[PDB]
CSV table of C-alpha atoms and ligand atoms in Angstrom, one decimal:
chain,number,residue,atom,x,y,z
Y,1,UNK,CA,0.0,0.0,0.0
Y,2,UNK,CA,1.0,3.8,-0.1
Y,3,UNK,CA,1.2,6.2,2.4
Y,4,UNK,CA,1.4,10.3,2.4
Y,5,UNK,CA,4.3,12.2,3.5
Y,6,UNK,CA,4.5,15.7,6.0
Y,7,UNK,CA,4.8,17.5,2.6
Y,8,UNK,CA,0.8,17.3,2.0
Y,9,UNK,CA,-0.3,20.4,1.1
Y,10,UNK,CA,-4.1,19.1,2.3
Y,11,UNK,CA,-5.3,20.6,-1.1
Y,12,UNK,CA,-8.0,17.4,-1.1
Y,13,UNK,CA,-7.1,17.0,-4.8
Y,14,UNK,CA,-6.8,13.0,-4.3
Y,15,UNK,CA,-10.2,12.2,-2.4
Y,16,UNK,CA,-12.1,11.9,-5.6
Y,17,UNK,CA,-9.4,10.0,-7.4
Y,18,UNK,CA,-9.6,7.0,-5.0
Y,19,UNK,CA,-11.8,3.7,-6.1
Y,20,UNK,CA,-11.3,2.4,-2.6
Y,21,UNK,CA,-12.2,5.5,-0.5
Y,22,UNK,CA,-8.8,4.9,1.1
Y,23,UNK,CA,-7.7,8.4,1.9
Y,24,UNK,CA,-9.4,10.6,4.7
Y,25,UNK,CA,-8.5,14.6,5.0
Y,26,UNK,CA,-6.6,14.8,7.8
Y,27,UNK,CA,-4.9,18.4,9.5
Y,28,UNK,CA,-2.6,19.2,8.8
Y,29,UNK,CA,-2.0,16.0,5.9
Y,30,UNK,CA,-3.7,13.5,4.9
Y,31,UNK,CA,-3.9,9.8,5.7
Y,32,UNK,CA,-4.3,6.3,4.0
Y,33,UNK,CA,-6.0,3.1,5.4
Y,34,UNK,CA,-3.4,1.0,4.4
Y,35,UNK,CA,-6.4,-1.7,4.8
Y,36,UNK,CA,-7.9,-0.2,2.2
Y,37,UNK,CA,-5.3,0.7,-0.4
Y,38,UNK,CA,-5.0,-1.3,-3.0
Y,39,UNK,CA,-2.3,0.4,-5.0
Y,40,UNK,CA,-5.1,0.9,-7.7
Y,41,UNK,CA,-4.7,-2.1,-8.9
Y,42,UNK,CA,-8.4,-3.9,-9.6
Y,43,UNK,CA,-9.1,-0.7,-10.6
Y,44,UNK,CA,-6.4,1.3,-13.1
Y,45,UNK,CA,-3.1,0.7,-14.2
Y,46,UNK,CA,-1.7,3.5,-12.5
Y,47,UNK,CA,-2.3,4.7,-8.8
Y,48,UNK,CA,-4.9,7.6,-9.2
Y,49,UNK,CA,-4.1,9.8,-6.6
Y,50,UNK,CA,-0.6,10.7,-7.6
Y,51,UNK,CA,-2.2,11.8,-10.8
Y,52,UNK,CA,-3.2,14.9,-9.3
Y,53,UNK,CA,-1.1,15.1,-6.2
Y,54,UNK,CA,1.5,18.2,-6.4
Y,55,UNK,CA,3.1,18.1,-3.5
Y,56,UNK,CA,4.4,14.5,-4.8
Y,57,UNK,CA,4.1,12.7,-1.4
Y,58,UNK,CA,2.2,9.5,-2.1
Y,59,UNK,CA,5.5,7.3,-1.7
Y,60,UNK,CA,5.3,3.3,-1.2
Y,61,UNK,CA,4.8,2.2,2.7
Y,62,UNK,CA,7.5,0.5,3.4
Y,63,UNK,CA,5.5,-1.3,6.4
Y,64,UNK,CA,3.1,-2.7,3.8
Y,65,UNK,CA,5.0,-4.0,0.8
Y,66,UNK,CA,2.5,-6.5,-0.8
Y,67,UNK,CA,2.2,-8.2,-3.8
Y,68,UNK,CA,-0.4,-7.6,-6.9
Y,69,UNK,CA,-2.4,-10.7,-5.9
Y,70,UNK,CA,-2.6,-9.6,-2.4
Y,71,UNK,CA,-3.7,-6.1,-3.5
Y,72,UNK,CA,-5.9,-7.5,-6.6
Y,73,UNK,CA,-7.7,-10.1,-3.3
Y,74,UNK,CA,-7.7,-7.1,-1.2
Y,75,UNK,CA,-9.7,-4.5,-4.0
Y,76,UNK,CA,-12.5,-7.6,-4.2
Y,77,UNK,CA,-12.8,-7.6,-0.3
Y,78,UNK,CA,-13.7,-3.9,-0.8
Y,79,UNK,CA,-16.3,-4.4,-3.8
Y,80,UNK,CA,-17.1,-7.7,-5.2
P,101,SF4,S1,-3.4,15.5,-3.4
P,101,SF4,FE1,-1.2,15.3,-2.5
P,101,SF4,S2,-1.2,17.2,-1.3
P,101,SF4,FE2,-3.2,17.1,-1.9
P,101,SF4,S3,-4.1,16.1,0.0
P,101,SF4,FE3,-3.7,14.5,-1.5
P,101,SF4,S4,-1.6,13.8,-0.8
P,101,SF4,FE4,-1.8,15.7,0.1
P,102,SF4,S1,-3.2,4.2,-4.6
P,102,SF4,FE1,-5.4,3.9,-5.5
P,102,SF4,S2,-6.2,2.8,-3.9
P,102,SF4,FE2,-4.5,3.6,-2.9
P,102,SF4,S3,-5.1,5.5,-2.0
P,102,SF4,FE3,-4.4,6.1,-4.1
P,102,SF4,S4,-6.2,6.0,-5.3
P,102,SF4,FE4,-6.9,4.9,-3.3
């Protein structure tokens, strides 16, 4: 899963990104259920919140280094 850094600007530009509703606005950043992220994959090719994020602090968590079945099992558990 990801996590976000101390350099979050808190501009809420990544809310609507996420398939998995895995980011909550926080004060003063942001934070990720890392029971919930599923690295976009299920979902897009790409992890969608980075897309917009301009403060570039979306980084991998190093505490959560799973694999793409793990994440692809994890993304059903959230929808089907
Ligand atoms: S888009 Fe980047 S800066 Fe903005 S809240 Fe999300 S993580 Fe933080
Ligand atoms: S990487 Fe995908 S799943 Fe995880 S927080 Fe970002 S948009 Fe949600």
């Amino acid at each position: 899963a990801l996590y976000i850094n101390d350099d979050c600007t808190a501009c809420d530009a990544c809310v609507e990104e996420c398939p998995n509703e895995a980011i909550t606005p926080g004060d003063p950043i942001y934070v990720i259920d890392p029971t919930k992220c599923s690295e976009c994959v299920g979902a897009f090719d790409e992890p969608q919140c980075r897309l917009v994020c301009p403060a570039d602090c979306i980084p991998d968590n190093p505490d959560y280094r799973e694999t793409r079945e793990e994440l692809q099992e994890k993304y059903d558990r959230l929808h089907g």
